[PDB]
Amino acid sequence: IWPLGKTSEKYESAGRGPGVISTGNGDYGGASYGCYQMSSNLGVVQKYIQSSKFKEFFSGLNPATKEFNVVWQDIASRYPQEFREEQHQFIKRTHYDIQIGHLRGKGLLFEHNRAAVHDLIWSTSVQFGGRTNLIFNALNGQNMESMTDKDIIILVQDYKLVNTERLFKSSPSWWSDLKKRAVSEKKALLELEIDGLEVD
Amino acid sequence: CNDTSGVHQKILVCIQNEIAKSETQIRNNISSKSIDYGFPDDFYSKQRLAIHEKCMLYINVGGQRGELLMNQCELSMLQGLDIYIQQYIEDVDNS
């Protein structure tokens, strides 16, 4: 029933359709593509294209050029539903699926389908990377045998809040935004955990 | 930039608009100086490239966080460079 990643949806995709393009301002602004606004700056959209069914449509075409954008918007016109889903699957495969694995490698398992804790994992993997140690670090030295989904959600979101200044030392004008988000997701994940829903 | 509400792409746009502004401040200040002050033609573009390569190290930091820090680095470095070019121009004037 519950769609995986919905809790952090507004920070990541924000209601965007599969054909949205923004051209970054600046000499090296590049461009960002699709529902999740995958940038050309850090090679993300290029990886997506390599993995896509539409890979060959883009043969010879470089991201952040009009030609590439023409073809991107053509595909989103003519295959809206498939493109959107292929984009979403790519974010899932490159963040959430990777974090599930990374956590397994630290001895943390989540072999169930309860929505709240899986939204937490998705969110965190997107914000801090598929290989982030944030969850592991926040759960460090707790008893997993006797820990509830609610406790997990509390520990992780408080860790985020309280380490914001350290993890984002270089960007202090965003601390207020980032701290609020950690507080707000905590509320929303706690509500979601009570409704006791299912994902995947 | 008061209504980002933690939306990642909106934060990037804010940072990117500041970067572009600073690039334009720097580039126009160099442009406005007489053949006198000694700025090589390719001074801006070489320093800008070196800044980019410096900040592109953040490609090795995962997720939204790495991207935010990459862009924030670009901005702070350009701001540093703008102040430096001003100060140099002053040191030439003060001579």
* Structural domain containing residue B44: 1-95
Resolution of this structure in Å = 2.3
Contacts of residues A65-70 at CB distance under 8 Å and 24 or more positions apart, as own/partner, are A69/A21, A69/A31
Q: Which of A119, A151, A122, A123 is nearest to A138 (CA)?
A: A151
Residue A133 sits at the chain B interface (C-beta within 8 Å) = no
Query: How big, in percent rounded to 5, are the helix, strand and coil portions of chain B?
Result: 80, 0, 20
Residue A175 sits at the chain B interface (C-beta within 8 Å) = no
Per-residue tokens: A126: 């997107």
Asked if residue B72 lies in contact with residue A167, where contact means CB atoms within 8 angstroms, the answer is no
C-alpha distances (whole Å) from B52 to each of A28, A179, B48, B63 are 8, 28, 6, 19
* Residues of A taking part in catalysis: 27
d(CA A34, CA A51): 15
Dihedral over Cα of B82, B83, B85, B86: its sign: positive
Per-residue tokens: A15: 């209601």
**CA max distance for chain B:** 49
Strand residue runs (E) in chain A: 21-23, 31-33, 38-39
Q: How many domains does chain B have?
A: 1
Give the method used. Answer: X-ray
d(CA B58, CA A42): 9
What length does chain B have? 95
Tracing tokens 């529902």 back to the chain, one arrives at: A35
Residues of chain A with Cβ-Cβ distance to B74 below 8 Å are: 26, 28
Q: Which residues 29-48 of B have a C-beta within 8 angstroms of A?
A: 48
d(CA B59, CA B69): 10
CA dihedral A170, A175, A177, A182 (to 10 degrees): 110
Q: Which of B66, B7, B68 is nearest to A171 (CA)?
A: B68
CA dihedral B71, B77, B81, B84 (to 10 degrees): 150
C-alpha distances (whole Å) from B49 to each of A31, A180, B76, B94 are 18, 35, 15, 30
Residue A163 sits at the chain B interface (C-beta within 8 Å) = no
Region of residue B62 (phi > 0: left; psi between -120 and 50: alpha; otherwise: beta)? beta
Give the residue on B whose Cα is nearest the Cα of A27. Answer: B20
C-alpha distances (whole Å) from A57 to each of A21, A45, A70, A75, A196 are 17, 14, 11, 9, 43
Q: Which of A30, A25, A27, A3 is nearest to A122 (CA)?
A: A3
Query: What CATH number did the domain enclosing B6 receive?
Result: 1.10.8.1160
Strand order in A31-33's β-sheet?
A21-23, A31-33, A38-39
Q: Which of A46, A180, A31, A129 is nearest to B58 (CA)?
A: A129
C-alpha distances (whole Å) from A146 to each of A38, A101, A149, A150 are 39, 22, 10, 12
Residue A11 sits at the chain B interface (C-beta within 8 Å) = yes
Region of residue B63 (phi > 0: left; psi between -120 and 50: alpha; otherwise: beta)? left
d(CA A120, CA A135): 9
d(CA B67, CA B61): 8
